Each structure stands twice: as structure tokens, then as C-alpha cells.
Design an enzyme around this catalytic site. Structure first.
Site, PDB file in Angstrom:
ATOM      1  CB  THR B  27      -0.890   0.041   1.249  1.00  0.00           C
ATOM      2  OG1 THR B  27      -1.496  -1.243   1.434  1.00  0.00           O
ATOM      3  CG2 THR B  27      -1.983   1.113   1.130  1.00  0.00           C
ATOM      4  CB  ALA B  84      10.339   1.065   2.744  1.00  0.00           C
ATOM      5  CG  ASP B  85       7.400   5.641   5.351  1.00  0.00           C
ATOM      6  OD1 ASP B  85       6.769   6.256   4.450  1.00  0.00           O
ATOM      7  OD2 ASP B  85       6.824   4.892   6.169  1.00  0.00           O
ATOM      8  CE  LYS B  95       5.797  -1.348   4.462  1.00  0.00           C
ATOM      9  NZ  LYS B  95       5.742   0.022   3.945  1.00  0.00           N
ATOM     10  N   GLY B  96       5.020   2.451   7.602  1.00  0.00           N
ATOM     11  CA  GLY B  96       3.795   2.899   8.246  1.00  0.00           C
ATOM     12  C   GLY B  96       3.433   4.366   8.112  1.00  0.00           C
ATOM     13  N   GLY B  98       1.976   5.520   5.455  1.00  0.00           N
ATOM     14  CA  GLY B  98       0.635   5.427   4.907  1.00  0.00           C
ATOM     15  C   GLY B  98      -0.397   4.806   5.833  1.00  0.00           C
ATOM     16  CD  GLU B 104       2.237  -1.322   4.364  1.00  0.00           C
ATOM     17  OE1 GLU B 104       2.812  -0.809   5.360  1.00  0.00           O
ATOM     18  OE2 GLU B 104       1.930  -0.676   3.332  1.00  0.00           O
TER      19      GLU B 104
END
Lengths: 226, 230
Positions: B27, B84-85, B95-96, B98, B104
Site C-alpha cells: 500500500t 518503505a519510508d 514503514k507505516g 501510509g 503490511e
């Protein structure tokens, strides 16, 4: 019965003006009744409930209430347990309030347990271990719990807990999987293994939380310590 | 722009997607471009079945005719592809951003492999400049906030904690949880921090992915690069 005297001994650890975490189940309710008697003589205390059912009890009997948002640190949590071992590691969550119980106990300086002699065991694990899981991806989470168990040298059935016909939903929106491992000789390692599963929200092993435990024996009342 | 770099990475990652494997579909903006490239491939008879990591991933996939399944129905997957951020040289991630970190992580952990796809701005020397998402239970939010600060303190970290908001009220995760974004700035030992956060009963999960990603396809203008694992 003796259940009463066990709670009454635990209430001696409660100080005037304490911020208290209050458990759930048959034994903690009796502690509520006896502490309500004490406020009713000007004993001052404020409590965080670990369930709706405890919360109701406190209000009907005049035990003042607060929240972890308003009262984020507590002095003492008093609560029951399904199994107590001699390190005062516990299995909790037979009642379905495992998460709120962990959060309240973890927010406290000390936790006292109240149990009868039958809950004290050589080795934790005959009582099935409640594991709180997200409903998304339950199938893969079941696989991972068995593989996590295998890696720690254990095995046993995993049973999705039901109420009426349907899966049990916790106060926080999760399912519970009761893991019947039989013997859990190293709780800390199993706890690590289960936390490494993303689907796992939390589980009923309370490790290093109970500083003391009041046990209703066949002989009489006894306290275990740390 | 950013957009065409995310496409080139998505296309290089689909070089790894084989006929008939079961897929974890990520996502966010970069996983979106991978979905289209998979859909364009579907209509010419490509065979695949995918598990969505979010509410909006599922709707895109259904809008494009990507076969969709469940982890209850399809509990093990071959490959997850996701953004990935932050990615570091060990292929540890944050991550996270979004908001889908929990699904995920569940999806990726159920896969034989996880490939990341990101643009080059996502590659880091040291994790932590992107604030670390932490997924928390609504019950006991105050005590969980404190414990996160206590865990950070024991790992030598500090920074603001912001309950993540959307339209004026807390963002609610697909799984019914809140996100606390922890601005630690620099996280030199992710593993130690991950253990300290799991020890909080209020913490459901967090955006550190350690040892999950097997490779990372990165775009950038100095060309396409797949990062690998020491």
C-alpha cells in the site's frame, strides 16, 4: 469462603491515597467489596478498572474511578490469575480481560495477585495460554504461533476462542487463541517468540509484574514474595 | 518526477514475480504503480493471486481485475512487494507512513520473501529521521505514551510523540488501533528499540521491519539498483 480472607489480606497492602489498578474475575470483585467498606469509613483511594464489569462494580459500591489517561501511573494493581509459578510469573486471560489487565499492571509500581492453592503450579502451562490476535490474517498467525512454539521446544493445539457460536471479541477488538502447550518452562523466550509475530497483539504471560501473591491454602492464607 | 522513479522500481521488482505465485500487495503511492504494472500484465493472461495490505489497495486491485484472496484462505505467500519510508544498508526499514504497517508486517512475515520498492530519497545511512510509526491500543493511551518515552529513554532516544490525526480526530487503523509517530531522529540499534517497544502491553506493533526484506529495488537517477543482504 477463604476467598474472602485472601482478598482481605491483599487489601492490607493498600495505602490511604493510593492510585489503584483493579482486576477482573471472581477474586478481584471480592477485593472491591471489602475496599468499598473501607472508603465508606473515609479511606481515600482512586481506581482504574480493567473491564466494564469491574467498572460497574466500583460505581455501585462507591469505589472512586479514574482512567489511565487522567491517571497514567498507578501505585498498585491487585488482580487474579489462572496460574502462578514460583517466579511469580503468571498465566492470565481466562477471563478475556488480558490486555487491559497487562496495561494497567504495567502502568503500576507493583502488582499483587490473589489466588487459591490450586492456581500455584510447579510449571506454567497446563492452563491454555491466551494469545490476543488481530482478526486480519488469523490463518497466517496460527501458523506462526505453531512455528514460534516449535522453535522454543513446545507443541499443542491452538483453539480460536468462541462465545455463543461466534469468535470471542475482546474489549479492544481482537480474537483470542488459547494455546495448550502443557508446559511452558521458559516464559520469557516464548513471550519473545510470540511478540515477533506481527499478528500477535499480546498474550497472557505476566512476567516480572507480580511482586507478591496472596494464596488461599487448604491450611490457611499465605503470601509469596520477590 | 518522483512518480516515474517509483514506476521504474516497480517494473524491476515485477521481474521477480513469476507465473502463479501468491503475492502480498503493498500500500501507498509506490505500491500503486506496481499494481498497474501487474494489471497491464494480467490482461495479457498473466496468472497471480494477491492479498491486500489495506482497504484502498483492495479497491484498486478489484478495479483492475487483479485476483484477490485472504490470509485466512491463503495463509502463506511466495512474495510480498511493498514500499518503505526508509531503507538502510542492512535492509532494515521504517514503514507505516501510509498507516498500513500492521497488515503490511503480517503480510510480509507470511511470505517467503519481501522486496521493497522505493525511490532513492528513501535510502538512509541510519534509520530514524522519518518518525517511527507505533501502533497502539486505544485503552490506556496515557500509560502507553509514558512507556514509549521510558523505552526510548533506555535506548538513549528522545523526541516528540504525536498521536496521528486525520480530519481532526485520531487516525483509526484498519485493525482498530491508533498510531503514535515517534520522532527519535536517529535509531542506531533498531533491534533493541523493537524489543523495548514490544515490552509495552499497549503497543500492538511498530514500523521497524528488521530482517524481513530480502531485497530492495531502488530507482534514483544514478540508475536502478537492487540492494541485498550482507
Amino acid at each position: 469462603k477463604l476467598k474472602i480472607a485472601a482478598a482481605a489480606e491483599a487489601l492490607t497492602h493498600v495505602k490511604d491515597g493510593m492510585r489503584l489498578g483493579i482486576g477482573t474475575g471472581s477474586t478481584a470483585e471480592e477485593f472491591v467489596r471489602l475496599l468499598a467498606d473501607k472508603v465508606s469509613n473515609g479511606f481515600k483511594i482512586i481506581g482504574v478498572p480493567t473491564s466494564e464489569r469491574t467498572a460497574k462494580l466500583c460505581k455501585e459500591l462507591g469505589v472512586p474511578l479514574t482512567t489511565l489517561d487522567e491517571t497514567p501511573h498507578l501505585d498498585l494493581t491487585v488482580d487474579g490469575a489462572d496460574e502462578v509459578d514460583t517466579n511469580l510469573s503468571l498465566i492470565k486471560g481466562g477471563g478475556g480481560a488480558l490486555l487491559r489487565e497487562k496495561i494497567v499492571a504495567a502502568a503500576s509500581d507493583a502488582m499483587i495477585v490473589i489466588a487459591d492453592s490450586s492456581k500455584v503450579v510447579e510449571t506454567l502451562g497446563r492452563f491454555p495460554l491466551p494469545v490476543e490476535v488481530n482478526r486480519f490474517g488469523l490463518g497466517a498467525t496460527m501458523r506462526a504461533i505453531e512455528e514460534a512454539a516449535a522453535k522454543c521446544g513446545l507443541a499443542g493445539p491452538l483453539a480460536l476462542r468462541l462465545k455463543d457460536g461466534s469468535p470471542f471479541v475482546t474489549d479492544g477488538g481482537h480474537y483470542i487463541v488459547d494455546a495448550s502447550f502443557g508446559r511452558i518452562p521458559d516464559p520469557k523466550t516464548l513471550s519473545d517468540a510470540l511478540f515477533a509475530i506481527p499478528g500477535v497483539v499480546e498474550h497472557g504471560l505476566f512476567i516480572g509484574l507480580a511482586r507478591a501473591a496472596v494464596v488461599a491454602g487448604n491450611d490457611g492464607i499465605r503470601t509469596m514474595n520477590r
